[PDB]
Amino acid sequence: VGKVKVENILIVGFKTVIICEVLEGMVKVGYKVRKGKKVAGIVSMEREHKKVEFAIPGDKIGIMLEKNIGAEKGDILEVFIVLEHHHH
Ligand code: NI
């Protein structure tokens, strides 16, 4: 299971941003992040303050979620893959 480590929570005007380090696996817009019994989807991601689609172990990213899940500095959050049946 993918994992990210929370470094900080930012409040940027109308946005709540989780700054985290990718520890394991791939992390992609559309995947879910879980803390305890709270799960939310990733709506958007930034790396180096530039909008990105996915991130890999070693990346420091900012993520915005569909809803807040109580993320705090030091939390190791699990990342759930969400299948995208595009019918290619
Ligand atoms: Ni892509």
TrEMBL record:
GO terms for molecular function: GTP binding. It comes from the Archaea. Residues 1-78 form the Elongation factor Tu-type domain. One of its GO terms (biological process) is translation. This is Elongation factor Tu-type domain-containing protein. It comes from Pyrococcus abyssi (strain GE5 / Orsay).
